[PDB]
Amino acid sequence: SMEQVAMELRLTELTRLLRSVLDQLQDKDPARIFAQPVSLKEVPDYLDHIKHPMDFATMRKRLEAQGYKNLHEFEEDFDLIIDNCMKYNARDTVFYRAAVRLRDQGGVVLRQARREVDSIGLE
């Protein structure tokens, strides 16, 4: 149907905007601490601690499959990256501190992304 196509165009448009958001967020992680999933070979007990691992590569996979239906779902996954890190790692670590900085700087980006999704009406 034509209605189904219109919806798919909106989803495609949303995916385009989220791809830009993802690129902007990942630039706030120049150390690339959050680029890839935590290795279970190098951190064998990780899943005992963290029940829902997340990382930028995994987000990008879901994104290109148009698997984010709205901004909230995308933000949930970004929050997982930050929150997982701040639980597993102690305050005095380069990992924890990198997550704080990503959260603070990412807030700016997500604030205007929400305005754009609402304004252009992608959800």
mmCIF file of N, CA and C in Angstrom:
data_model
loop_
_atom_site.group_PDB
_atom_site.id
_atom_site.type_symbol
_atom_site.label_atom_id
_atom_site.label_comp_id
_atom_site.label_asym_id
_atom_site.label_seq_id
_atom_site.Cartn_x
_atom_site.Cartn_y
_atom_site.Cartn_z
ATOM 1 N N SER A 1 0.823 -1.204 0.000
ATOM 2 C CA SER A 1 0.000 0.000 0.000
ATOM 3 C C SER A 1 0.862 1.261 0.000
ATOM 4 N N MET A 2 0.249 2.388 -0.336
ATOM 5 C CA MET A 2 0.952 3.668 -0.352
ATOM 6 C C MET A 2 1.271 4.124 1.069
ATOM 7 N N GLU A 3 0.350 3.860 1.991
ATOM 8 C CA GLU A 3 0.553 4.221 3.396
ATOM 9 C C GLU A 3 1.780 3.493 3.973
ATOM 10 N N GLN A 4 1.927 2.214 3.642
ATOM 11 C CA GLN A 4 3.070 1.438 4.123
ATOM 12 C C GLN A 4 4.383 2.016 3.597
ATOM 13 N N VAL A 5 4.391 2.443 2.337
ATOM 14 C CA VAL A 5 5.565 3.095 1.747
ATOM 15 C C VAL A 5 5.925 4.422 2.421
ATOM 16 N N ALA A 6 4.905 5.216 2.736
ATOM 17 C CA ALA A 6 5.117 6.486 3.424
ATOM 18 C C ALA A 6 5.782 6.253 4.779
ATOM 19 N N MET A 7 5.276 5.268 5.518
ATOM 20 C CA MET A 7 5.828 4.902 6.821
ATOM 21 C C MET A 7 7.279 4.481 6.687
ATOM 22 N N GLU A 8 7.557 3.695 5.657
ATOM 23 C CA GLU A 8 8.915 3.219 5.430
ATOM 24 C C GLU A 8 9.851 4.372 5.076
ATOM 25 N N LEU A 9 9.335 5.371 4.369
ATOM 26 C CA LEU A 9 10.137 6.553 4.057
ATOM 27 C C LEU A 9 10.468 7.326 5.336
ATOM 28 N N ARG A 10 9.504 7.404 6.243
ATOM 29 C CA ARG A 10 9.717 8.093 7.510
ATOM 30 C C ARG A 10 10.791 7.363 8.305
ATOM 31 N N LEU A 11 10.676 6.039 8.370
ATOM 32 C CA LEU A 11 11.667 5.216 9.064
ATOM 33 C C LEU A 11 13.049 5.390 8.446
ATOM 34 N N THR A 12 13.107 5.421 7.116
ATOM 35 C CA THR A 12 14.366 5.646 6.414
ATOM 36 C C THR A 12 14.940 7.015 6.754
ATOM 37 N N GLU A 13 14.072 8.018 6.812
ATOM 38 C CA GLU A 13 14.491 9.367 7.173
ATOM 39 C C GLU A 13 15.013 9.416 8.612
ATOM 40 N N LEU A 14 14.318 8.732 9.512
ATOM 41 C CA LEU A 14 14.747 8.661 10.906
ATOM 42 C C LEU A 14 16.122 8.009 11.003
ATOM 43 N N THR A 15 16.299 6.925 10.254
ATOM 44 C CA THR A 15 17.561 6.201 10.235
ATOM 45 C C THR A 15 18.694 7.101 9.749
ATOM 46 N N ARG A 16 18.405 7.937 8.752
ATOM 47 C CA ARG A 16 19.387 8.895 8.263
ATOM 48 C C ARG A 16 19.806 9.877 9.362
ATOM 49 N N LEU A 17 18.832 10.395 10.097
ATOM 50 C CA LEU A 17 19.116 11.352 11.164
ATOM 51 C C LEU A 17 19.896 10.679 12.304
ATOM 52 N N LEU A 18 19.496 9.464 12.671
ATOM 53 C CA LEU A 18 20.179 8.718 13.739
ATOM 54 C C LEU A 18 21.607 8.328 13.353
ATOM 55 N N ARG A 19 21.845 8.092 12.068
ATOM 56 C CA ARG A 19 23.200 7.796 11.622
ATOM 57 C C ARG A 19 24.114 8.997 11.865
ATOM 58 N N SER A 20 23.585 10.194 11.628
ATOM 59 C CA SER A 20 24.310 11.429 11.893
ATOM 60 C C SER A 20 24.524 11.630 13.396
ATOM 61 N N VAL A 21 23.475 11.390 14.179
ATOM 62 C CA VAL A 21 23.587 11.440 15.636
ATOM 63 C C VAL A 21 24.648 10.450 16.135
ATOM 64 N N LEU A 22 24.629 9.226 15.613
ATOM 65 C CA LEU A 22 25.583 8.214 16.052
ATOM 66 C C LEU A 22 27.003 8.664 15.735
ATOM 67 N N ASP A 23 27.203 9.241 14.555
ATOM 68 C CA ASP A 23 28.538 9.698 14.190
ATOM 69 C C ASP A 23 29.006 10.819 15.104
ATOM 70 N N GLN A 24 28.102 11.724 15.455
ATOM 71 C CA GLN A 24 28.452 12.824 16.340
ATOM 72 C C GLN A 24 28.776 12.334 17.747
ATOM 73 N N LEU A 25 28.003 11.367 18.229
ATOM 74 C CA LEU A 25 28.244 10.801 19.555
ATOM 75 C C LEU A 25 29.579 10.077 19.614
ATOM 76 N N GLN A 26 29.887 9.307 18.577
ATOM 77 C CA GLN A 26 31.108 8.518 18.583
ATOM 78 C C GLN A 26 32.356 9.404 18.477
ATOM 79 N N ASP A 27 32.195 10.619 17.965
ATOM 80 C CA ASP A 27 33.312 11.562 17.925
ATOM 81 C C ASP A 27 33.687 12.040 19.324
ATOM 82 N N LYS A 28 32.762 11.887 20.264
ATOM 83 C CA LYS A 28 33.009 12.276 21.646
ATOM 84 C C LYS A 28 33.731 11.173 22.419
ATOM 85 N N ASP A 29 34.097 10.113 21.703
ATOM 86 C CA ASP A 29 34.843 8.969 22.245
ATOM 87 C C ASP A 29 36.101 8.747 21.401
ATOM 88 N N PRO A 30 37.013 9.734 21.404
ATOM 89 C CA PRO A 30 38.164 9.624 20.501
ATOM 90 C C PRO A 30 39.079 8.464 20.885
ATOM 91 N N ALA A 31 39.067 8.089 22.162
ATOM 92 C CA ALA A 31 39.857 6.953 22.628
ATOM 93 C C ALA A 31 39.318 5.613 22.113
ATOM 94 N N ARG A 32 38.101 5.631 21.564
ATOM 95 C CA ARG A 32 37.417 4.440 21.038
ATOM 96 C C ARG A 32 37.200 3.344 22.091
ATOM 97 N N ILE A 33 36.944 3.782 23.315
ATOM 98 C CA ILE A 33 36.689 2.869 24.423
ATOM 99 C C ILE A 33 35.355 2.126 24.247
ATOM 100 N N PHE A 34 34.419 2.766 23.554
ATOM 101 C CA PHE A 34 33.069 2.217 23.407
ATOM 102 C C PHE A 34 32.746 1.731 21.990
ATOM 103 N N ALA A 35 33.786 1.619 21.173
ATOM 104 C CA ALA A 35 33.652 1.292 19.755
ATOM 105 C C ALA A 35 33.183 -0.138 19.471
ATOM 106 N N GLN A 36 33.624 -1.086 20.293
ATOM 107 C CA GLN A 36 33.379 -2.510 20.054
ATOM 108 C C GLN A 36 32.831 -3.186 21.316
ATOM 109 N N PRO A 37 32.154 -4.335 21.164
ATOM 110 C CA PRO A 37 31.692 -4.990 22.397
ATOM 111 C C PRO A 37 32.848 -5.404 23.294
ATOM 112 N N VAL A 38 32.612 -5.382 24.601
ATOM 113 C CA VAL A 38 33.589 -5.906 25.543
ATOM 114 C C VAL A 38 33.867 -7.377 25.212
ATOM 115 N N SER A 39 35.147 -7.719 25.086
ATOM 116 C CA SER A 39 35.566 -9.084 24.771
ATOM 117 C C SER A 39 35.413 -10.057 25.939
ATOM 118 N N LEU A 40 34.662 -11.130 25.725
ATOM 119 C CA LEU A 40 34.466 -12.112 26.777
ATOM 120 C C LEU A 40 35.710 -12.975 26.944
ATOM 121 N N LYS A 41 36.628 -12.887 25.986
ATOM 122 C CA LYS A 41 37.904 -13.583 26.111
ATOM 123 C C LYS A 41 38.838 -12.826 27.050
ATOM 124 N N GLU A 42 38.775 -11.504 26.993
ATOM 125 C CA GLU A 42 39.614 -10.662 27.829
ATOM 126 C C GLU A 42 38.943 -10.290 29.154
ATOM 127 N N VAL A 43 37.612 -10.319 29.177
ATOM 128 C CA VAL A 43 36.853 -10.087 30.410
ATOM 129 C C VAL A 43 35.824 -11.202 30.585
ATOM 130 N N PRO A 44 36.298 -12.385 31.007
ATOM 131 C CA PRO A 44 35.475 -13.595 31.025
ATOM 132 C C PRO A 44 34.260 -13.512 31.947
ATOM 133 N N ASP A 45 34.301 -12.694 32.998
ATOM 134 C CA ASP A 45 33.166 -12.623 33.922
ATOM 135 C C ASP A 45 32.160 -11.522 33.573
ATOM 136 N N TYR A 46 32.328 -10.876 32.418
ATOM 137 C CA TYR A 46 31.548 -9.657 32.133
ATOM 138 C C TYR A 46 30.031 -9.854 32.251
ATOM 139 N N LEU A 47 29.526 -10.975 31.748
ATOM 140 C CA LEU A 47 28.084 -11.199 31.708
ATOM 141 C C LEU A 47 27.492 -11.527 33.078
ATOM 142 N N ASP A 48 28.341 -11.865 34.043
ATOM 143 C CA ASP A 48 27.896 -12.000 35.425
ATOM 144 C C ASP A 48 27.555 -10.637 36.015
ATOM 145 N N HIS A 49 28.172 -9.596 35.466
ATOM 146 C CA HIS A 49 28.018 -8.235 35.971
ATOM 147 C C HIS A 49 26.985 -7.446 35.184
ATOM 148 N N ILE A 50 27.128 -7.507 33.871
ATOM 149 C CA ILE A 50 26.357 -6.693 32.946
ATOM 150 C C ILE A 50 25.409 -7.566 32.118
ATOM 151 N N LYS A 51 24.111 -7.339 32.275
ATOM 152 C CA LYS A 51 23.123 -8.230 31.674
ATOM 153 C C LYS A 51 22.783 -7.873 30.235
ATOM 154 N N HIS A 52 22.999 -6.614 29.869
ATOM 155 C CA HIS A 52 22.725 -6.170 28.510
ATOM 156 C C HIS A 52 23.860 -5.310 27.955
ATOM 157 N N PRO A 53 24.940 -5.967 27.500
ATOM 158 C CA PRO A 53 26.085 -5.252 26.927
ATOM 159 C C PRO A 53 25.689 -4.412 25.714
ATOM 160 N N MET A 54 26.395 -3.307 25.503
ATOM 161 C CA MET A 54 26.138 -2.481 24.335
ATOM 162 C C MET A 54 27.418 -1.748 23.950
ATOM 163 N N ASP A 55 27.481 -1.329 22.692
ATOM 164 C CA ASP A 55 28.655 -0.650 22.137
ATOM 165 C C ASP A 55 28.255 0.015 20.827
ATOM 166 N N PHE A 56 29.112 0.882 20.294
ATOM 167 C CA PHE A 56 28.776 1.631 19.085
ATOM 168 C C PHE A 56 28.637 0.741 17.840
ATOM 169 N N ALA A 57 29.460 -0.297 17.724
ATOM 170 C CA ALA A 57 29.367 -1.180 16.566
ATOM 171 C C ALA A 57 28.034 -1.928 16.529
ATOM 172 N N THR A 58 27.603 -2.402 17.690
ATOM 173 C CA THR A 58 26.335 -3.104 17.811
ATOM 174 C C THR A 58 25.169 -2.164 17.498
ATOM 175 N N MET A 59 25.239 -0.919 17.972
ATOM 176 C CA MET A 59 24.214 0.076 17.634
ATOM 177 C C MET A 59 24.155 0.294 16.127
ATOM 178 N N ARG A 60 25.322 0.416 15.504
ATOM 179 C CA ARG A 60 25.369 0.723 14.081
ATOM 180 C C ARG A 60 24.763 -0.420 13.263
ATOM 181 N N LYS A 61 24.969 -1.655 13.712
ATOM 182 C CA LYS A 61 24.357 -2.806 13.053
ATOM 183 C C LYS A 61 22.836 -2.714 13.080
ATOM 184 N N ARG A 62 22.287 -2.431 14.254
ATOM 185 C CA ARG A 62 20.843 -2.321 14.402
ATOM 186 C C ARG A 62 20.309 -1.150 13.587
ATOM 187 N N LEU A 63 21.073 -0.067 13.565
ATOM 188 C CA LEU A 63 20.699 1.130 12.825
ATOM 189 C C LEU A 63 20.549 0.862 11.330
ATOM 190 N N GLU A 64 21.520 0.168 10.746
ATOM 191 C CA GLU A 64 21.511 -0.075 9.305
ATOM 192 C C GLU A 64 20.452 -1.096 8.894
ATOM 193 N N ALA A 65 19.949 -1.848 9.865
ATOM 194 C CA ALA A 65 18.816 -2.729 9.644
ATOM 195 C C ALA A 65 17.508 -1.989 9.911
ATOM 196 N N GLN A 66 17.600 -0.665 10.031
ATOM 197 C CA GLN A 66 16.460 0.187 10.392
ATOM 198 C C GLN A 66 15.721 -0.359 11.613
ATOM 199 N N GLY A 67 16.490 -0.748 12.630
ATOM 200 C CA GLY A 67 15.947 -1.378 13.818
ATOM 201 C C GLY A 67 15.609 -0.430 14.962
ATOM 202 N N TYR A 68 15.832 0.870 14.769
ATOM 203 C CA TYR A 68 15.369 1.863 15.741
ATOM 204 C C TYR A 68 14.097 2.546 15.229
ATOM 205 N N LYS A 69 12.969 2.305 15.892
ATOM 206 C CA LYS A 69 11.684 2.829 15.407
ATOM 207 C C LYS A 69 11.436 4.270 15.846
ATOM 208 N N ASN A 70 12.175 4.711 16.856
ATOM 209 C CA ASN A 70 12.037 6.065 17.378
ATOM 210 C C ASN A 70 13.320 6.459 18.092
ATOM 211 N N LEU A 71 13.433 7.727 18.478
ATOM 212 C CA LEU A 71 14.653 8.206 19.127
ATOM 213 C C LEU A 71 14.838 7.581 20.504
ATOM 214 N N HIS A 72 13.736 7.332 21.211
ATOM 215 C CA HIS A 72 13.821 6.759 22.553
ATOM 216 C C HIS A 72 14.585 5.432 22.555
ATOM 217 N N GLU A 73 14.313 4.579 21.568
ATOM 218 C CA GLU A 73 14.975 3.275 21.483
ATOM 219 C C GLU A 73 16.478 3.435 21.274
ATOM 220 N N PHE A 74 16.845 4.398 20.440
ATOM 221 C CA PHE A 74 18.244 4.715 20.170
ATOM 222 C C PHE A 74 18.912 5.214 21.452
ATOM 223 N N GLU A 75 18.249 6.133 22.144
ATOM 224 C CA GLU A 75 18.797 6.665 23.392
ATOM 225 C C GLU A 75 18.960 5.588 24.465
ATOM 226 N N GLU A 76 18.044 4.626 24.499
ATOM 227 C CA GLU A 76 18.138 3.532 25.458
ATOM 228 C C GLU A 76 19.453 2.785 25.299
ATOM 229 N N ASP A 77 19.828 2.534 24.051
ATOM 230 C CA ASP A 77 21.055 1.795 23.761
ATOM 231 C C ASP A 77 22.280 2.643 24.076
ATOM 232 N N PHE A 78 22.215 3.942 23.803
ATOM 233 C CA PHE A 78 23.336 4.827 24.138
ATOM 234 C C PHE A 78 23.514 4.877 25.656
ATOM 235 N N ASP A 79 22.405 4.981 26.375
ATOM 236 C CA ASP A 79 22.470 4.990 27.834
ATOM 237 C C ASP A 79 23.061 3.684 28.375
ATOM 238 N N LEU A 80 22.804 2.562 27.698
ATOM 239 C CA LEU A 80 23.380 1.283 28.111
ATOM 240 C C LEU A 80 24.899 1.323 28.049
ATOM 241 N N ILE A 81 25.438 1.918 26.987
ATOM 242 C CA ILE A 81 26.895 1.980 26.838
ATOM 243 C C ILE A 81 27.512 2.672 28.050
ATOM 244 N N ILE A 82 26.946 3.824 28.387
ATOM 245 C CA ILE A 82 27.410 4.639 29.507
ATOM 246 C C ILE A 82 27.189 3.948 30.849
ATOM 247 N N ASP A 83 25.955 3.521 31.078
ATOM 248 C CA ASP A 83 25.587 2.957 32.370
ATOM 249 C C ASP A 83 26.308 1.652 32.699
ATOM 250 N N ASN A 84 26.515 0.808 31.696
ATOM 251 C CA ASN A 84 27.229 -0.459 31.884
ATOM 252 C C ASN A 84 28.643 -0.187 32.363
ATOM 253 N N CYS A 85 29.273 0.772 31.702
ATOM 254 C CA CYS A 85 30.655 1.143 31.994
ATOM 255 C C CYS A 85 30.797 1.693 33.404
ATOM 256 N N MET A 86 29.840 2.526 33.810
ATOM 257 C CA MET A 86 29.933 3.173 35.104
ATOM 258 C C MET A 86 29.604 2.196 36.234
ATOM 259 N N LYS A 87 29.036 1.031 35.919
ATOM 260 C CA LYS A 87 28.844 0.038 36.974
ATOM 261 C C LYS A 87 30.058 -0.887 37.071
ATOM 262 N N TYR A 88 30.523 -1.390 35.936
ATOM 263 C CA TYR A 88 31.616 -2.360 35.928
ATOM 264 C C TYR A 88 32.932 -1.756 36.397
ATOM 265 N N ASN A 89 33.163 -0.507 36.017
ATOM 266 C CA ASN A 89 34.431 0.160 36.299
ATOM 267 C C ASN A 89 34.315 1.154 37.447
ATOM 268 N N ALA A 90 35.363 1.259 38.255
ATOM 269 C CA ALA A 90 35.341 2.161 39.403
ATOM 270 C C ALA A 90 35.537 3.615 38.981
ATOM 271 N N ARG A 91 35.152 4.537 39.857
ATOM 272 C CA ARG A 91 35.280 5.976 39.599
ATOM 273 C C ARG A 91 36.669 6.475 39.216
ATOM 274 N N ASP A 92 37.711 5.817 39.712
ATOM 275 C CA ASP A 92 39.060 6.312 39.491
ATOM 276 C C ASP A 92 39.710 5.720 38.237
ATOM 277 N N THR A 93 38.898 5.210 37.316
ATOM 278 C CA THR A 93 39.437 4.552 36.127
ATOM 279 C C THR A 93 39.227 5.384 34.880
ATOM 280 N N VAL A 94 40.117 5.197 33.910
ATOM 281 C CA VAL A 94 40.004 5.892 32.625
ATOM 282 C C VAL A 94 38.694 5.500 31.923
ATOM 283 N N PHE A 95 38.251 4.265 32.128
ATOM 284 C CA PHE A 95 36.984 3.820 31.544
ATOM 285 C C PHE A 95 35.769 4.583 32.076
ATOM 286 N N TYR A 96 35.645 4.647 33.393
ATOM 287 C CA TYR A 96 34.521 5.353 34.013
ATOM 288 C C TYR A 96 34.523 6.812 33.596
ATOM 289 N N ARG A 97 35.699 7.430 33.644
ATOM 290 C CA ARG A 97 35.784 8.851 33.340
ATOM 291 C C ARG A 97 35.450 9.121 31.877
ATOM 292 N N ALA A 98 35.798 8.188 31.001
ATOM 293 C CA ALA A 98 35.460 8.349 29.587
ATOM 294 C C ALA A 98 33.944 8.303 29.390
ATOM 295 N N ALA A 99 33.268 7.473 30.178
ATOM 296 C CA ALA A 99 31.812 7.387 30.098
ATOM 297 C C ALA A 99 31.134 8.665 30.604
ATOM 298 N N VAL A 100 31.669 9.270 31.661
ATOM 299 C CA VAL A 100 31.104 10.517 32.161
ATOM 300 C C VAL A 100 31.188 11.608 31.093
ATOM 301 N N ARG A 101 32.346 11.688 30.444
ATOM 302 C CA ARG A 101 32.587 12.699 29.427
ATOM 303 C C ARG A 101 31.715 12.477 28.195
ATOM 304 N N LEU A 102 31.530 11.217 27.820
ATOM 305 C CA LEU A 102 30.642 10.876 26.706
ATOM 306 C C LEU A 102 29.190 11.232 27.030
ATOM 307 N N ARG A 103 28.756 10.928 28.249
ATOM 308 C CA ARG A 103 27.403 11.281 28.661
ATOM 309 C C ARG A 103 27.175 12.790 28.651
ATOM 310 N N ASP A 104 28.126 13.548 29.178
ATOM 311 C CA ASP A 104 27.962 15.000 29.258
ATOM 312 C C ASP A 104 27.929 15.635 27.879
ATOM 313 N N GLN A 105 28.874 15.247 27.032
ATOM 314 C CA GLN A 105 28.980 15.821 25.694
ATOM 315 C C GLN A 105 27.882 15.316 24.764
ATOM 316 N N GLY A 106 27.463 14.075 24.972
ATOM 317 C CA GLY A 106 26.407 13.491 24.168
ATOM 318 C C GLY A 106 25.056 14.127 24.442
ATOM 319 N N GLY A 107 24.881 14.631 25.663
ATOM 320 C CA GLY A 107 23.646 15.287 26.060
ATOM 321 C C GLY A 107 23.296 16.447 25.147
ATOM 322 N N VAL A 108 24.311 17.222 24.783
ATOM 323 C CA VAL A 108 24.144 18.352 23.879
ATOM 324 C C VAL A 108 23.533 17.901 22.553
ATOM 325 N N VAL A 109 24.112 16.840 22.001
ATOM 326 C CA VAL A 109 23.742 16.296 20.703
ATOM 327 C C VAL A 109 22.322 15.735 20.712
ATOM 328 N N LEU A 110 22.000 14.983 21.756
ATOM 329 C CA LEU A 110 20.686 14.365 21.881
ATOM 330 C C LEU A 110 19.584 15.391 22.137
ATOM 331 N N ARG A 111 19.938 16.500 22.780
ATOM 332 C CA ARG A 111 18.966 17.551 23.056
ATOM 333 C C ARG A 111 18.401 18.135 21.758
ATOM 334 N N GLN A 112 19.280 18.415 20.798
ATOM 335 C CA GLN A 112 18.845 19.003 19.539
ATOM 336 C C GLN A 112 18.279 17.925 18.610
ATOM 337 N N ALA A 113 18.778 16.695 18.718
ATOM 338 C CA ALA A 113 18.213 15.583 17.950
ATOM 339 C C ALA A 113 16.732 15.374 18.279
ATOM 340 N N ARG A 114 16.373 15.516 19.553
ATOM 341 C CA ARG A 114 14.981 15.367 19.958
ATOM 342 C C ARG A 114 14.125 16.467 19.328
ATOM 343 N N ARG A 115 14.625 17.695 19.347
ATOM 344 C CA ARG A 115 13.927 18.792 18.692
ATOM 345 C C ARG A 115 13.708 18.508 17.199
ATOM 346 N N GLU A 116 14.729 17.975 16.528
ATOM 347 C CA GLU A 116 14.660 17.711 15.087
ATOM 348 C C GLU A 116 13.681 16.596 14.728
ATOM 349 N N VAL A 117 13.652 15.549 15.546
ATOM 350 C CA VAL A 117 12.742 14.433 15.315
ATOM 351 C C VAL A 117 11.299 14.898 15.476
ATOM 352 N N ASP A 118 11.046 15.691 16.512
ATOM 353 C CA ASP A 118 9.725 16.286 16.720
ATOM 354 C C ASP A 118 9.346 17.262 15.602
ATOM 355 N N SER A 119 10.259 18.172 15.279
ATOM 356 C CA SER A 119 9.984 19.239 14.319
ATOM 357 C C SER A 119 9.704 18.689 12.926
ATOM 358 N N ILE A 120 10.606 17.842 12.435
ATOM 359 C CA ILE A 120 10.446 17.235 11.120
ATOM 360 C C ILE A 120 9.377 16.144 11.143
ATOM 361 N N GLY A 121 9.012 15.701 12.344
ATOM 362 C CA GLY A 121 7.990 14.681 12.513
ATOM 363 C C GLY A 121 8.394 13.334 11.947
ATOM 364 N N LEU A 122 9.326 12.669 12.620
ATOM 365 C CA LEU A 122 9.863 11.395 12.144
ATOM 366 C C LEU A 122 9.387 10.223 12.998
ATOM 367 N N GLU A 123 8.436 10.495 13.886
ATOM 368 C CA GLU A 123 7.994 9.520 14.878
ATOM 369 C C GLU A 123 6.509 9.683 15.204
#
